[PDB]
Design a protein around this ligand. Structure first.
Ligand SMILES: N#Cc1ccc(C(=O)Nc2ccc(F)c([C@]3(CF)C[C@@H](C(F)(F)F)OC(N)=N3)c2)nc1
Ligand code: NA
Ligand code: NA
Length: 379
């Protein structure tokens, strides 16, 4: 408990392309890099020579592969993949010293799913069976891991933004990865890691919306999405408020919509004109909340691959959503996040690796008194 040196720094990535862990599949073991995704629940790996893939699962080479004789077709808003379901032996080399028999979707066809240039070739869905495809009888990886071993039913993620890196501690927490205290919010329902946001402030100024708007139709914590995505009506109020707070510089409207980049002369980003963003989350106790605060260093994302420019260019990474709030890597890179599935709750603490400056830091503070927090959930 509390110290897992073998798992520290077991994540890698590049800006824009997410965080992956090494895994092995099959006998003898085939090494693959796998995107860590708390926003889905399938373990799905490229299993054919798509041109974007460094490596892919070759079932023919595994003596322990078992075919389930069942296909799956999985479309998302953008992107889709199709695969053939089976089971095989899976390990995490920089993870617990265990091997488990897990479901795997061998991806045989995909569109807009793999990233050209990335170094990962499958996804590890860490959420619950309820959103597994094709249905909840396909047990997710982490459920198999916990049923089949003595690994405790929890994992924690420290995502260190811009090469990016970080740690996924499987079966515990490592107290060297955060400072101050962990504060916990209840998992409202086990499907996504759904939570309830009870208040939102921009530089300490409350947006004063009906709090159900913050969770319409849900709010989730999702390592497989880059942005902080907010329900449209909340996005509108938040942007209006951020524009006001930064109004000593004027930016094109398209910037706030994520339709164009903004660039400054190198080493001169005016961090201090941009406000901090605070989300208050439902706490463990009746009428008690806590708040997490992030900086422009989290929500203004560096874009380095801008071949048509010399300067430091950034994308605004808070965007409008029609699927609820998504606390993607913009939120998670401020914090050490504990997915305490055994107690159905999510812990946040200030990350020991988060990007900040001499004036401001990411923060996790409580307790606050917040009434009617159960009305903030959408049914
Ligand atoms: N930081 C960062 C960062 C950068 C890139 C990325 C990245 O490419 N993710 C990725 C790629 C294809 C994918 F199909 C998905 C999916 C898989 F289920 C669907 C996606 C949705 F539902 F939104 F389509 O939401 C989530 N949660 N997972 C995620 N992830 C994180
Ligand atoms: Na167990
Ligand atoms: Na600590």
């Amino acid at each position: 408990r509390g110290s897992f040196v073998e798992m520290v720094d077991n994540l890698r990535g590049k800006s824009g392309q997410g965080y992956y862990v090494e895994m092995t599949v099959g006998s003898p073991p085939q090494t693959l890099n796998i995107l860590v995704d708390t926003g889905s629940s399938n373990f799905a790996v490229g299993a054919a020579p798509h041109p974007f893939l460094h490596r892919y699962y070759q079932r023919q080479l595994s003596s322990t592969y078992r075919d389930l004789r069942k296909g799956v077709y999985v479309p998302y808003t953008q992107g889709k993949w199709e695969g053939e379901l089976g089971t095989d032996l899976v390990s995490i080399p920089h993870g617990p010293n265990v091997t488990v028999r897990a479901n795997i979707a061998a991806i045989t066809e995909s569109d807009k799913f793999f990233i050209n240039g990335s170094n990962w070739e499958g996804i590890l869905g860490l959420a619950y069976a309820e959103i597994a495809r094709p249905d909840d009888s396909l047990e997710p990886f982490f459920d198999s891991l916990v049923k089949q071993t003595h690994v405790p039913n929890l994992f924690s993620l420290q995502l260190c933004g811009a090469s990016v890196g970080g740690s996924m501690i499987i079966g515990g927490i490592d107290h060297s990865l955060y400072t101050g205290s962990l504060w916990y919010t209840p998992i409202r329902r086990e499907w996504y890691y759904e939570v309830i946001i009870v208040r939102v402030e921009i530089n300490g100024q409350d947006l004063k919306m009906d709090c159900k708007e913050y969770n319409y139709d849900k709010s989730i914590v999702d390592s497989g999405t880059t942005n902080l995505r907010l329900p449209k009506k909340v996005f509108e109020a938040a942007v209006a408020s951020i524009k006001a707070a930064s109004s000593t510089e004027k930016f094109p409207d398209g910037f706030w919509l994520g339709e164009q980049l903004v660039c400054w002369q190198a080493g001169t980003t005016p961090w201090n004109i941009f406000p901090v963003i605070s989300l208050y989350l439902m706490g463990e106790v009746t009428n008690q909340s806590f708040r997490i605060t992030i900086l422009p260093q989290q929500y203004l994302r560096p874009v380095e691959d801008v071949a048509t420019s010399q300067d430091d260019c950034y994308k605004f990474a808070i965007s409008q959503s029609s699927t609820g709030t998504v606390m993607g890597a913009v939120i998670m890179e401020g914090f050490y996040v504990v997915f305490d599935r055994a107690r159905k709750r999510i812990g946040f603490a200030v990350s020991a690796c988060h990007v900040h400056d001499e004036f401001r830091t990411a923060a996790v503070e409580g307790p606050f008194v917040t009434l009617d927090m159960e009305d903030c959930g959408y049914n």
